[PDB]
Ligand code: HEM
C-alpha cells in the first residue's frame with residue numbers, strides 16, 4: 001500500500017474501534033492500524049518531496065510513526081486484556097498524534 | 107526490503123553504535139534500525155512459512171518487533187539528549203529482544 005491507502009486504513013479502523021462491541025474486534029482493528037503505520041513510515045509525503053532522506057523534517061516524520069505505533073501497541077494490550085472502553089479511549093487519545101503530524105506535513 | 111536485508115541493517119547499525127564517535131551517529135543508526143524493524147514487521151519468517159498470516163505464531167512474531175521498536179525508540183531519545191554512553195549500553199541490551207525472537211523463530 002502507498003501512503004494514502006495506509007492513512008485510509010488508519011482512518012477506517014479508528015471508526016471501527018469507536019463502534020466495536022467487544023475486545024477482539026478492537027484488538028484486531030488495532031493490529032491493522034499498527035501494520036499500516038509501520039508500512040507508511042518509509043513513505044515520502046508530497047510536501048517533503050524535495051528534502052533529503054536524512055533531513056530533520058523526514059526524521060521527524062519517521063518519529064511521528066514511532067510515537068503512533070507506540071500508542072497503538074499500548075492500546076493493543078488494553079484490548080488484549082479485555083478492557084474494551086479503556087482501549088476505545090486509548091484509540092481516541094491517539095488522535096493528538098494524527099493531528100500533530102497533519103498540521104506539519106499533510 | 108526482504109527480511110534478510112532488514113536483519114542485516116539491524117546487525118550493521120548495532121556495530122556502528124558500538125563504536126560511534128558522537129550522539130548524532132548513534133541517533134542516525136538507531137533510526138535506521140527502527141525503520142528496518144518497521145519494514146520487517148510484515149515479513150513471514152522461514153520458520154512459519156506454512157502458517158497463516160493471522161496465526162497465533164505470526165501474531166507473537168509481530169509482537170517481538172513492536173517490543174523491539176519501543177526499545178529502539180527509547181534508545182534513540184537517550185542518543186538525542188546527548189547521553190551517548192547510556193544510549194550505547196541501551197543498544198547493547200536490545201540483543202535480549204534479538205535473541206529472544208531468534209530463539210523462538212530463527
Ligand atoms: C491513526 C491516526 C491517523 C489517521 C486516522 C490519519 C488519517 C489520514 C487521512 C484520512 C488522510 C487522507 C488521505 C486519503 O484521502 O486517503 C491522511 C493524509 C495524510 N497523513 Fe494521516 N492519519 C493518521 C496519522 C498520521 C501520522 C502519524 C502522520 C505523519 C507521521 C500522517 C501523515 C499524513 C500525510 C503526510 C498525509 C497526506 C498524504 C498525501 O497527500 O499523499 N498521518 N491521513
Ligand code: HEM
Nearest residue numbers: 110113114116117151167170171174200203204207211212
Ligand atoms: C537489534 C536486534 C536484531 C538484530 C541485530 C538481528 C540480527 C539478525 C541477523 C544477523 C540475522 C541473520 C540473517 C542474516 O544473515 O542477515 C537475523 C535473522 C533473523 N531474525 Fe533477527 N535480529 C534482531 C532482532 C530480531 C527480532 C526482534 C526478530 C523477530 C521479532 C527477528 C527475527 C529474525 C528472523 C525470523 C531471522 C531469520 C531470517 C533469515 O535469515 O532467513 N530478529 N537477525
Ligand SMILES: [Zn+2]
Nearest residue numbers: 001002039040
Ligand atoms: Zn505498502
Ligand SMILES: [Zn+2]
Nearest residue numbers: 063067179183
Ligand atoms: Zn519519541
Ligand SMILES: [Zn+2]
Nearest residue numbers: 073169172173
Ligand atoms: Zn507488547
